[PDB]
Design a protein around this nucleic acid. Structure first.
Length: 604
RNA sequence: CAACGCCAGCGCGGAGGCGUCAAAUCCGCGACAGUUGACCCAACGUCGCCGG
DNA sequence: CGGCGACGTTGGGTCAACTGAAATGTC
DNA sequence: GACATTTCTCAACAAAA
């Protein structure tokens, strides 16, 4: 009942998404954008109420002056970086910018302290602004739900997700980091929701109750076919394939009657099921998420449920997994592991999980070299796509300047040689090619033929690139989850450090390395995705109730476990092995990190 | 011709098809907790500065 | 040609909050 | 009255540009 899971079923690809589903997705999108605009108009009001007090106004003026000076100096140092191919300008502007940034930071802290001091005096005004936002959200509910064909479950899902997002943005900006809500362009993707409410004195929302299409207490919302997993797992793969092809009925939301009223509307999505929830689970909700890859729009419906815990374990080795992104002969070495007891690696994972020695107590995890090649092919083909888009932009501009401006078929802004010359995305060229293939403009036959030829070629290349790279990335994640499943299956405890890979990626610009080498390293880290491997290991260990421990990452790479000495940062950590200063031994950083990891785990 | 992508969730492997205004599904194995937003990075195209 | 940077578009990698039900007003 | 929908809200403090 603590442990939440999500059972995902994959909607049939031949399913033509009904107009109701797309209208609901668009309503959810528009609602999110309206909430974003409400947040912008709330931040403006709160900034104004802060600026009302004169002390904060003076501090903000000082901050603005320092901002202007710092912007000038930063432009200067960027110019110097361009002039001196060094990434470290060596100009007086560098020290000037450092001092100006420190003074600006102190000014911002002074303003923040003044705000904190004056907060209690402005408590009523802040409360009123918050009340205005909340009442605007209630009116948004009435606009979209009471009168607006958006199912209240989708509205509540979007509003709860947005409120969580604004809470996390406020928390991020409490720590002093850039964080602000952004808009997104409608893409045909999104999610709709159904909340199954269980009041007091109601039966548990078990899969058998939900599957009961005739008398189930939640027929009006959701109907998910269900086989008992005891029966389900026994049968063949083909039998499960055929028996999982079932329709799920969701409550999509209202539709507008010609008389001006609403009529409830359900969708019957034909989904392929592969796995069933436990008969003890409480089905909390359901979501139909529409995602896009290439030109293709796919859909998956996930039934969220709460499962009881099956009891912790205490029989197995302790395993320490230390993350990395070192290139190697066989592939990126994502992580190195070491165990207190020897491990028998399954033959299917022989390449992926490698052991250094016959003791088999220490080894590494290797992303295959083929995944890297299959991801690099995407860049190879995006080169062709963008060259082709540039060529068709040239042709369109040439034809337009020969034959003058052409009226838009139905677009508000007429297409002209200038606007086409300023078009960037291939979306616009595809849209024009579609609009013109049917109804070419005056003397537009040749240009429409070329436009459609380009759009055919580009769509083919787009599908191939996006699908190839997506399949390669999901193969990588499949390998990550195979490794995580193995470890959570054998391990009695799993040791992971709390090393924020997000910070590692962000601060890589200060690497004192050539930016090309920084970009090679960051591309490798992205392709191997160590943070995904660690998250998978932690998740698999949590599901199987295998205990996990987190050790501080401070000193893991520098400190030599045998030496006990923290080597300096310029000890050639990029290459291996690294020479310890304390004893002059060429120790390996990965093995030492794992050893200190196990030590710090046991000490805790 | 191949390669690449698609063909009842996802990945790997095999058979048979389709070439995007398309098609067609079938079989074995493994894993599977997902939605959101924020941030960062990368790729690609065009360009600028400096240097060989 | 390579080092440094701008612009724009497109998409992925990391980290984390969350996964509810009482009250109310209909048919 | 059994069922579907409305409702509830705790809060500031962001960076390069």
């Amino acid at each position: 009942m603590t442990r939440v899971t999500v059972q995902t079923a994959g909607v049939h690809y031949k399913w033509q998404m009904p107009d109701q589903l797309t209208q609901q997705l668009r309503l959810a999108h528009d609602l999110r954008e309206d909430l974003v605009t409400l947040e912008y108009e709330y931040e403006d009001a709160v900034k104004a109420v802060w600026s009302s007090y004169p002390a904060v106004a003076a501090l903000e003026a000082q901050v603005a002056e320092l901002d202007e000076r710092a912007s000038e100096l930063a432009s200067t140092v960027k110019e110097e970086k361009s002039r001196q191919r060094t990434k470290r300008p060596s100009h007086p502007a560098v020290a000037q910018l450092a001092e100006t940034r420190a003074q600006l930071k102190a000014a911002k802290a002074s303003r923040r302290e003044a705000i904190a001091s004056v907060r209690d005096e402005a408590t009523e005004r802040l409360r009123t602004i918050s009340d205005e936002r909340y009442a605007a959200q209630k009116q948004l509910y009435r606009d979209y739900c009471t009168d607006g064909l958006l199912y209240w479950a989708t509205f509540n899902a979007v509003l709860d997700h947005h409120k969580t997002a604004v809470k996390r943005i406020a928390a991020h900006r409490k720590q002093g980091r850039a964080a602000q809500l952004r808009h997104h362009r409608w893409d045909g993707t999104g999610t709709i929701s159904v909340q199954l409410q269980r009041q007091a004195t109601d039966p548990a929302r078990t899969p058998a109750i939900i599957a009961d299409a005739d008398t189930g207490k939640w027929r009006s919302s959701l109907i998910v076919p269900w086989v008992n997993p005891d029966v389900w797992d026994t049968m063949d793969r083909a039998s499960r394939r055929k028996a999982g092809r079932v329709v799920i009925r969701m409550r999509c939301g209202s539709s507008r009657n010609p008389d001006g009223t609403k009529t409830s509307e359900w969708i019957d999505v034909p989904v392929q099921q592969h796995r069933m929830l436990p008969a003890d689970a409480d089905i909390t909700a359901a979501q139909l998420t529409v995602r896009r890859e290439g030109a293709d729009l796919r859909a998956t419906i996930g039934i969220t449920a709460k499962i009881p815990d099956q009891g912790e374990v205490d029989e197995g080795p302790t395993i320490a997994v230390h993350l990395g992104w070192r290139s190697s002969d066989h592939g990126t070495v994502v992580a190195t592991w070491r165990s207190t007891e020897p491990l028998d690696i399954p033959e299917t994972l022989r390449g992926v999980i490698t052991t250094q020695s016959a003791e088999r107590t220490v080894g590494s995890i290797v992303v295959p070299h083929r995944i890297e090649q299959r991801v690099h092919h995407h860049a190879t083909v995006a080169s062709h796509r963008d060259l082709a888009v540039d060529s068709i932009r040239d042709t369109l501009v040439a034809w337009l300047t020969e034959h003058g401006p052409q009226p838009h078929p139905y677009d508000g802004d007429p297409i002209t040689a200038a606007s086409v010359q300023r078009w960037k995305a291939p979306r616009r060229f595809a849209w024009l090619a579609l609009q013109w293939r049917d109804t070419p403009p005056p003397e537009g036959a040749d240009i429409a033929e070329t436009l459609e030829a380009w759009r055919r070629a580009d769509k083919k290349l787009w599908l191939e690139s996006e699908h190839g790279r997506g399949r390669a990335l999901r193969h990588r994640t499949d390998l990550h989850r195979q490794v995580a499943a193995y470890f959570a299956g054998v391990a009695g405890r799993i040791v992971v450090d709390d090393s924020d890979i997000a910070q590692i990626a962000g601060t890589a610009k200060h690497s004192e390395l050539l930016t090309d080498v920084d970009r090679q390293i960051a591309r490798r880290r992205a392709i191997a995705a160590p943070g995904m491997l660690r998250a998978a290991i932690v998740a698999a260990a949590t599901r199987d109730e295998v205990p996990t421990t987190t050790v501080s990452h401070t000193g893991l790479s520098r400190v030599h476990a045998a030496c006990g000495h923290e080597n300096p940062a310029d000890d050639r950590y990029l290459m291996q092995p690294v020479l310890c200063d304390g004893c002059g031994r060429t120790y390996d950083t990965d093995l030492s990190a794992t050893i200190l990891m196990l030590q710090r785990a046991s000490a805790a």
